[PDB]
Amino acid sequence: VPHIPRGPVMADIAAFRLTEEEKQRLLDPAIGGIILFRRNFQNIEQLKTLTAEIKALRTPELIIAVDHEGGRVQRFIEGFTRLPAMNVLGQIWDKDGASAAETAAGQVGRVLATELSACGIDLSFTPVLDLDWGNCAVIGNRSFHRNPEAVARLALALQKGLAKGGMKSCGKHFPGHGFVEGDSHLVLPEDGRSLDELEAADLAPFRIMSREGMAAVMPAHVVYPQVDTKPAGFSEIWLKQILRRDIGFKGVIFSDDLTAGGIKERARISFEAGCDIVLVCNRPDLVDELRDGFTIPDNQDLAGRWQYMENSLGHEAVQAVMQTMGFQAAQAFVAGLAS
Amino acid sequence: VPHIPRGPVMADIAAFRLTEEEKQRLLDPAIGGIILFRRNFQNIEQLKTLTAEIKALRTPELIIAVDHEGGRVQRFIEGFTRLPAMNVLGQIWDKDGASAAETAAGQVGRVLATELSACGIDLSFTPVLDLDWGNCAVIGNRSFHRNPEAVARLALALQKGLAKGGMKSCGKHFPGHGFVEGDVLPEDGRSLDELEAADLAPFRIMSREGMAAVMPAHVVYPQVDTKPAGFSEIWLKQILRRDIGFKGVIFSDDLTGIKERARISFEAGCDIVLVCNRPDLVDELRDGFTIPDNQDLAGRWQYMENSLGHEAVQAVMQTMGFQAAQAFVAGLAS
Ligand SMILES: CC(=O)N[C@@H]1[C@@H](O)[C@H](O)[C@@H](CO)O[C@H]1O
Ligand SMILES: CC(=O)N[C@@H]1[C@@H](O)[C@H](O)[C@@H](CO)O[C@H]1O
């Protein structure tokens, strides 16, 4: 079992089980993790086999992630508790108050994370910290609430739930996707507001989550012209000056999905902007192209940043906890929010 | 005022008033219409000036469209009734029943269309007919409901409301965007029979009842064709034209080289290609552009022209009936 540091590329895979070509690809030192999608999911037992064989390839084991937010963003359905959209938690906030909402958020986080942890997943890319300004359809009900205080507090409660289930958090989409309009899949929207306007609202949940141990951030594919002419995920100003320096964030900055102008070049500008890890999804050809003759950028923090995201619960421990009545009750409560 | 047939390209504009460059661009015979966005909107009086100067450039007047669906898809806010998201109507269906929901949909359509008609807009690109399978974030609350019958009936009711306000309808996104995940080119692995049993039904029914246009999904349905619907002869000619009998406009995807992308769109069966936020690509496309032979184009554009005159709209907006509709719709949105 070769010992290779985790590389700065997060790749993905085609279907339910690794092919031999995929095995060879995932051994490449450029690769440090894998993101899974619905096409990689048949059922829980197949998923476990898949994650196990991914992990067996090398050490430190490749980090495995998935998008389980809730509602219309939940890759794995059959055999999982159906998760509510995050705005359901903000509705509980408005109706039954903060305390009831935080409690509910904690249970959602716990169920979400624990069920995934049982299958060998390290991390879900959640929570969304975007504010519901009533402008952005693609975010829509994925946002907790309009109000930055409600968003921050529900997110922090969800984060504690996730940690019970073995997982860290990944805030999306820095520095805030809520204000732009977005309803035409694959446009690159413009947020004309000033930095002060963002500091007063959209940035606050990111600051607070950062302070409280958030492991990673996904950037918005959005241009904020008053701050920089470049989209946030390719902006030194956003990523180094604001997120690293001003906010003090020490975790992973993921790139957007880079999938021409060329993949090598697109990765280069991402790393140069301040991303730790680049995502290359649905395009194993571009991963092959990128990794061939790839020089790993010097990043002394990478190994620790990946390692902070490793699942904290052992597989047997998780199967045990899922048999408990306490956890089964949490499951039923969360299921109820989703119906 | 030059007389030029409406071309097969729908373009757009930068800001609140036409620049001289834009005027010259919109005179190109390749162009037949314009889509507006929030960046084009300051207030109602500015919008009226904008639409008037667009219309003054040529005859038949360039068709002007906008995305007023409701909720988080409503370009023009100030001075307009705030529209509810379409899933609000489906929640009324579930809670108060079909009859209350249809009535509410009719009123939403009427208010939506009438207020835009007063500003010189021809058409809103609505309704979304995608089913809420709970899978697709980019559709999200833009879908009426999970159930094809609820979607069809709420859409028909909205359509009647739109027609009262002077407008035709445009169903989106053919043959159904609801099942894929979308948060890239998504893949819907289902069979044609599965789609006929659900996602396609609202499109068939709307087509039968006079829908003017369709927008295709940027989605591949491999069991039917390896190409995305908007570039598929099978989806657009064989299924939509031949099998369903649809005679209206088929718009393309936002195509944002461009010449080749447009060519394959027209060849697949689109009448009109959309090129948004990229006047450079419109300039590139129109330069040396040959207009494809389409004897139906002129009538297809003309069917979408607003059916209410300016005076008629002002009259209806003063009525108590319309003002009440406005307040009812405002109440769904709050
Ligand atoms: C949301 C979606 O899937 N596609 C949209 C369509 O609804 C819209 O009318 C068109 C023109 O603005 O832009 C496409 O991106
Ligand atoms: C939906 C959205 O606005 N952005 C998504 C983000 O949520 C997701 O975590 C990431 C990885 O799949 O890809 C982007 O396309």
Contact B230, B252 (CB under 8 A): yes
Q: Which of B150, B148, B73, B145 is nearest to B112 (CA)?
A: B73
Q: Which helix (H) or strand (E) holds A156?
A: helix A148-164
Measure A182 CA to nearest chain B CA, in Å: 8
Q: Which residue's CA is minimally distant from atom 3 of ligand 1?
A: A184
Contact A233, A277 (CB under 8 A): no
Measure A163 CA to nearest chain B CA, in Å: 25
The resolution of the experimental structure, rounded to one decimal in Å, is 2.2
Amino acid at B243: D
Contact B117, B306 (CB under 8 A): yes
Torsion, Cα of A287, A291, A297, A301 (10° steps): 60
CB within 8 Å: A137 and B134:
no
Supply the Cα-derived Rg of chain A in whole angstroms.
19
User: What DSSP state is assigned to residue A294?
Assistant: P
Interface of A with B in 153-192 (CB under 8 A): 181-187
Q: Give the CA count within 13 Å in the CB-facing half-sphere of A141.
A: 24
| Joined tokens for residue A138 | 């693609």
Ligand 2: residue of A12, A138, A141, A173 to mutate (most ligand atoms within 8 A of CB) is: A173
Q: Which residue's CA is minimally distant from atom 10 of ligand 1?
A: A184
| Joined tokens for residue B72 | 């988080």
Ligand nearest to the CA of B125: 1
Method: X-ray
Q: Is B122 a catalytic residue?
A: no
Q: Does B138 touch chain A (CB under 8 A)?
A: yes
Contact A71, A85 (CB under 8 A): yes
All residues of chain B having their beta carbon less than 8 Å from the beta carbon of residue A142 are: 137, 183
Contact A106, A122 (CB under 8 A): no
CB-based contacts of A187: which residues, under 8 Å, 6+ apart? B254, B256, B276, B277
β partners of residue B40: none
Instruction: Quickly name the fold that domain A1-339 has.
Output: TIM Barrel (3.20.20)
Please work out whether the CB of residue A184 comes within 6 Å of at least one atom of ligand 1: yes
CATH second-level architecture of B1-334?
Alpha-Beta Barrel (3.20)
Q: What's the burial of A164, exposed, middle or buried (CB within 10 Å: 0-12/13-18/19+)? A: buried
Q: Can you tell me the distance from the alpha carbon of B153 to that of B145, in angstroms, rounded to the nearest whole number?
A: 10
Amino acid at B282: V
Would residue A75 be called left, alpha or beta, if left means φ above 0 and alpha means ψ between -120 and 50 degrees? alpha
| Joined tokens for residue A162 | 């996730």
Of the residues A132, A191, A228, A256, only one is catalytic, namely: A256
Q: Is B43 helix (H, G, I), strand (E, B) or coil?
A: coil
All residues of chain A having their beta carbon less than 8 Å from the beta carbon of residue B277 are: 187
Enumerate the known binding-site residues of B for substrate: 67, 75, 142, 172-173
Q: Can you tell me the distance from the alpha carbon of A232 to that of A240, in angstroms, rounded to the nearest whole number?
A: 11
β partners of residue A128: A172
How many other CB atoms sit within 10 Å of the CB of residue A73? 25
Q: What's the burial of B254, exposed, middle or buried (CB within 10 Å: 0-12/13-18/19+)? A: buried
Q: Does A338 touch chain B (CB under 8 A)?
A: no
Please work out whether the CB of residue A183 comes within 6 Å of at least one atom of ligand 1: yes
Q: Which of A211, A259, A287, A232 is nearest to A29 (CA)?
A: A287
Q: Give the CA count within 13 Å in the CB-facing half-sphere of B280.
A: 2
Q: What's the burial of A45, exposed, middle or buried (CB within 10 Å: 0-12/13-18/19+)? A: exposed
Enumerate the known binding-site residues of A for substrate: 67, 75, 142, 172-173
Separation of CA A221 and ligand 2 centre (Å): 9
- Where do the structural domains in chain B lie, given as residue ranges? 1-334
Measure B59 CA to nearest chain A CA, in Å: 30
C-alpha to C-alpha distances, B84 to B36, B144, B325, B332, nearest whole angstrom = 20, 11, 13, 6
Q: What's the burial of A10, exposed, middle or buried (CB within 10 Å: 0-12/13-18/19+)? A: buried
Contact A271, A278 (CB under 8 A): yes
Buried b (16+ CB within 10 A) or exposed e, A13-41: beeeebeeebeebbebbbbbbbbbbebbb
Q: Which helix (H) or strand (E) holds B215?
A: strand B213-216
Separation of CA A143 and ligand 1 centre (Å): 21
Contact B155, B87 (CB under 8 A): no
Q: Can you tell me the distance from the alpha carbon of B132 to that of B188, in angstroms, rounded to the nearest whole number?
A: 14
CB-based contacts of A304: which residues, under 8 Å, 6+ apart? none
| Joined tokens for residue B124 | 């809103």
All residues of chain A having their beta carbon less than 8 Å from the beta carbon of residue B136 are: 72
Minimum Cα–Cα distance from A84: chain B residue: B134
Centroid of chain to Cα B283? 24
Q: Is A154 helix (H, G, I), strand (E, B) or coil?
A: helix
Buried b (16+ CB within 10 A) or exposed e, B179-193: bbbbbeebebebebe
| Joined tokens for residue B172 | 């989106």
CB-based contacts of A339: which residues, under 8 Å, 6+ apart? A82
CB within 8 Å: A72 and B142:
no
Q: Which residue in the block uniquely carries the two structure tokens 């021409």? A: A260
Interface of B with A in 75-94 (CB under 8 A): 75
Q: What's the burial of A248, exposed, middle or buried (CB within 10 Å: 0-12/13-18/19+)? A: exposed
Contact B221, B214 (CB under 8 A): no
Q: What's the burial of A307, exposed, middle or buried (CB within 10 Å: 0-12/13-18/19+)? A: exposed
Q: Which helix (H) or strand (E) holds B225?
A: strand B225-228
